[PDB]
């Protein structure tokens, strides 16, 4: 099927582009219902939780915003009290009540019923022995549990988690012990990054804190003695933050799942809805942007294009904010349609050197490419280069047929350049060809495939369609259009399957066609299964609207061959009888 401009157009119409946007800020976790309900359950139950999602989602900002709205009972005062001159314990009193117990003791069961063991052990034998380090150490206190303590420690070192012993010259005492993140988060929330616990080697010590209440201030190797610090009942909720991959290290520890029961997973995409466009606008305004309707619409549509889905939008608020900040500079402080389009263009320019070199090499004939005419056994497939920002390029492919003993040879795979999935695609094509053409017994052909100017590894199955049509062309002696690039995976039954990076692929063929001078007949054949992924850039949409570029969507390899060879498989003088006649020719050459 031909894809009209109207079928390809995906962008949001803009009405009153320059009108200022006025919208209220959305709640924390907008469009992230799964993660929000997980966190609500963790808050309601006192459970430890982990926030999981790809980088640049805004996971940290959403979490701190949501925790800021919570309310708990005012946290107890928290202190170290000495039970001896070599031993300390962590104590909670009701709030504000340690400043009284400090004055009392500075009177060198009075009404501090919980502070007993400190006082009991505070008894006598200075008078009994003339024996010449003893007053309580307040770690924390606060006025209200609204908002609760919220401690985000990105740097999960033992001293930052557990506190430190200072040494006043050597000795030490209760009064020289500094609190850590764990102490500051009591009655509230400690937030840590999974990657920092791994990188800092503090995961085992952290588990000992949560499982056993072992919280040991960091000491030093010199100090001729230390204090014993008694374990204490931990009163805190821990929320870990990280990527799926940051967690996988931790997840192989059975203790991880035991301690962190509540998974709060962010979706990498939201529905592309009016409500999520509106929420994005209110979010950008709350960040301080001066947003026009046109600037909101373009950012919203760039989020859809980022997701490579007409119906979804990229959920990475941090990535949308960074693009908006570059737009705001190009707009002199105003976030407009133009400033967004021009920020996108300047990103591509700043990463274009590789493509400028490639396009110059094609123009000079140093890379041999055809974008017009016809040739047997040759096709432009499409690839993306595996370095950000993943530019697409045509990849010239040849198929040559000789009389032989049913061999399909991938030259790139035999030379070691082709990966396992690339190999799988060649095997799959072999299975299709052998089973499709059985009249002579096993295929009377040896077919060799080569990516002609490929010096580097190729992986993926998306050149399967180009490889199969090249192969059929070589068998039947079928001239194929070189003005249409081909992308698609094939199954053993000859059906065309979805491929990745379809926008980069299409745009990369358009870019080469344009650099060599558009003929008016160039285009791409791609999988019908990718229609929902097509969010093509303005310049390609306008070329298709102008009749200067053409998109074809297919379901079968044979539908692709019919377009490339300019004929039907049947209505015979069709391609199928030419393919059969080529196989009969090869079979005769192969026997006597």
């Amino acid at each position: 099927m031909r894809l009209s401009y109207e079928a390809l157009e995906w962008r949001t119409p803009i009405e009153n582009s320059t009108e200022p946007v006025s919208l209220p800020p959305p709640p924390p976790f907008f469009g992230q219902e799964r993660a929000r309900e997980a966190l609500e359950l963790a808050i309601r139950g006192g459970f430890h939780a982990y926030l999981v999602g790809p980088p640049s989602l805004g996971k940290h900002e959403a979490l701190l915003a949501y925790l800021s709205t919570q309310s708990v009972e005012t946290p107890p005062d928290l202190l170290y009290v000495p039970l001896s001159e070599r031993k300390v314990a962590v104590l909670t009193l009701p709030s504000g009540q340690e400043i009284h117990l400090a004055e009392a003791v500075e009177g060198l069961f009075q009404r501090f019923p919980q502070a007993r063991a400190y006082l009991e052990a505070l008894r006598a034998r200075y008078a009994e022995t003339g024996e010449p380090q003893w007053r309580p150490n307040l770690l924390t206190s606060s006025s209200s549990g609204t908002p609760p303590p919220i401690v985000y420690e990105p740097y999960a070192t033992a001293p930052r988690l557990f506190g430190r012993l200072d040494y006043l010259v050597w000795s030490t005492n209760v009064s020289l012990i500094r609190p850590g993140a764990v102490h500051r988060a009591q009655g509230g929330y400690l937030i840590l990054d999974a990657l920092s616990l791994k990188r800092e080697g503090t995961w085992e010590a952290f588990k000992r804190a949560l499982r056993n209440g072992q919280v040991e201030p960091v000491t030093e190797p010199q100090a001729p003695a230390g204090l014993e610090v008694e374990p204490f009942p931990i009163q805190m909720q821990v929320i870990l933050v990280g990527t799926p991959e940051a967690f996988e290290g931790l997840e192989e520890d059975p203790a991880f799942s035991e301690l962190f029961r509540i998974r709060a997973e962010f979706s990498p995409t939201l529905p592309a809805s009016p409500e999520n466009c509106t929420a994005l606008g209110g979010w950008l305004l709350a960040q301080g942007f001066q947003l026009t309707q046109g600037g909101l619409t373009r950012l919203y549509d760039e989020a859809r294009r980022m997701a490579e889905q007409r119906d979804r939008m990229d959920a990475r608020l941090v990535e949308i904010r960074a693009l908006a900040e570059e737009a705001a500079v190009l707009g002199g402080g105003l976030l407009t349609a133009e400033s967004v389009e021009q920020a996108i263009a300047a990103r591509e320019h700043r990463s274009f050197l590789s493509e400028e070199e490639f396009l110059r090499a094609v123009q000079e004939g140093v890379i041999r490419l055809r974008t017009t005419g016809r040739a047997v056994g040759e096709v432009n497939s499409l690839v993306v280069v595996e370095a950000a920002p993943y530019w697409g390029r045509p990849a010239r492919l040849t198929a040559r047929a000789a009389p032989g003993r049913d061999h399909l040879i991938s030259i790139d795979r035999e030379a070691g350049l082709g990966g396992q999935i690339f190999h799988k695609a060649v095997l799959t094509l072999a299975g299709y060809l052998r089973s499709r053409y059985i009249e002579h017994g096993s295929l009377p052909v040896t077919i060799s495939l080569a990516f002609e100017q490929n010096y580097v590894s190729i992986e993926g199955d998306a050149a399967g369609l180009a490889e199969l049509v090249a192969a059929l062309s070589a068998i039947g002696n079928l001239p194929l259009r070189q003005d249409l690039a081909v992308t698609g995976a094939v199954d053993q039954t000859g059906k065309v399957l979805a491929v990745g990076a379809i926008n980069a692929k299409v745009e990369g063929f358009f870019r080469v066609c344009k650099a060599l001078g558009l003929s008016g007949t160039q285009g791409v054949i791609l999988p019908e299964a990718n229609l929902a992924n097509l969010t093509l850039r303005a310049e390609v949409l306008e070329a298709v609207r102008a009749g200067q570029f053409h998109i074809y969507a297919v379901e079968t390899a044979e539908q692709a061959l019919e377009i490339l060879a300019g004929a039907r498989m049947e209505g015979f003088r069709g391609l199928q009888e030419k393919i059969r006649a080529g196989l009969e020719a090869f079979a005769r050459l192969e026997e006597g």
């Binding site: 497939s381 280069v385 595996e386 590894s457 190729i458 992986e459 050149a463």
Partner: peptide
């Protein structure tokens, strides 16, 4: 490296 390229990717199809």
């Amino acid at each position: 490296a390229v990717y199809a």
